[PDB]
């Protein structure tokens, strides 16, 4: 499987308002993908976590979703 | 059998019907090593069944056996304290042994006086679907589908 950073452009890791890019870093559910799947660095993931959470308080990214399978 | 598969014994074909199933049935009738007695019992019973009914005794032997074969049984398995009666299928080999054994043990519970009389009559009843053998088979198949709730313990 490819990683998210690999298939992506030059984006601002701090911009909490960009949903189009942040939604790429959530799972099927609303969870935050581990660095193994996001391809980010330790620092980069540390920043993404915060900006995703900020965006979740704004109603932009979800806290959790429902799994359609099984 | 802890090491190997314990291969099945290959019986000798029947001296009369050239058929192995018959030889095995004779073996289950035989007691105290009297195979001549058992064979004369079986064959005189073949005369009985072939006369009192005008059909070939071979086909009736096979049919009677076939109607006693159980397709499912129950086996205990030790699970978290007291064990459970757990249904599962029956090996074709085991269907064989069980059906023949049940046939003989049932025939000797018959009221008839002579051996070959009981053998013939039980063969006829079991081939028609009645008779004690078919009741042991129907009761075992009742053991499955009753404890069916444990179908996840298959093993």
């Amino acid at each position: 499987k490819a990683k998210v950073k690999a298939t992506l452009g030059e984006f601002d890791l701090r911009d909490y308002r960009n949903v189009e890019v942040l939604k790429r870093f959530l799972s099927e559910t609303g969870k935050i993908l581990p660095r193994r799947r996001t391809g980010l660095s330790a620092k980069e993931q540390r920043i993404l976590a915060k900006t995703i959470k900020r965006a979740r308080i704004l109603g932009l990214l979800p806290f959790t979703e429902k799994l359609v399978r099984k | 059998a802890r090491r190997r598969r314990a291969e099945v014994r290959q019986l000798q074909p029947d001296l009369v019907y050239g058929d192995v199933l018959v030889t095995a049935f004779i073996n289950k009738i035989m007691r105290d090593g009297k195979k001549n007695l058992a064979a004369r019992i079986f064959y005189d019973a073949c005369k009985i069944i072939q006369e009192k009914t005008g059909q070939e005794p071979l086909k009736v032997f096979k049919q009677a056996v076939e109607n006693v074969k159980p397709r499912m049984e129950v086996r205990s398995r030790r699970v978290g304290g007291a064990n459970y009666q757990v249904p599962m299928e029956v090996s074709p080999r085991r269907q064989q042994s069980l059906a023949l054994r049940w046939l003989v043990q049932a025939a000797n519970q018959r009221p008839e006086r002579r051996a070959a009389v009981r053998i013939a009559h039980e063969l006829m009843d079991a081939a028609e679907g009645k008779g004690g053998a078919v009741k042991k088979k129907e009761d075992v198949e009742r053991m499955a589908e009753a404890n069916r709730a444990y179908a996840h313990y298959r093993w």
Binding site: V68, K70 | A149, H152
Partner: protein, 116 residues
């Protein structure tokens, strides 16, 4: 007496029981079944067989109200959580979709000693 003909079927699957509710698309229930509704009483209620028979009882109870299309919601883990779904598929109800909505807290409430 309702004629919904389409709705939701909720599979609540715990280790001690599996119970099925069947509702209209607005969530309001129609009929339901459970492990105790069919004959079983004790531990046998949490078995996958009882999950099958509960699912089927509730599906037949849905037929009389006209149900054909069903969306399946699933909450919980336990034996016969899958078996209840597989019974729901061959129940004659066409299964529209299947979702797992099992509620997990974000570490809010202290569990019983049993769950630590």
């Amino acid at each position: 007496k309702r004629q919904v003909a389409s709705g939701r079927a909720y599979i609540h699957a715990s280790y001690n029981n599996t119970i099925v509710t069947i509702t209209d698309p607005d969530g309001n229930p129609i009929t339901w079944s459970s492990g105790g509704v069919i004959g079983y009483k004790g531990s046998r209620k949490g078995t996958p067989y009882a999950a099958q028979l509960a699912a089927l009882d509730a599906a037949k109870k849905a037929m009389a109200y006209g149900m054909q299309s069903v969306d399946v919601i699933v909450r919980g883990t336990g034996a016969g959580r899958e078996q209840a779904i597989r019974a729901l598929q061959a129940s004659g109800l066409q299964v529209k979709s299947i979702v797992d909505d099992t509620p997990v807290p974000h570490n809010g409430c202290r569990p019983k000693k049993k769950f630590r």
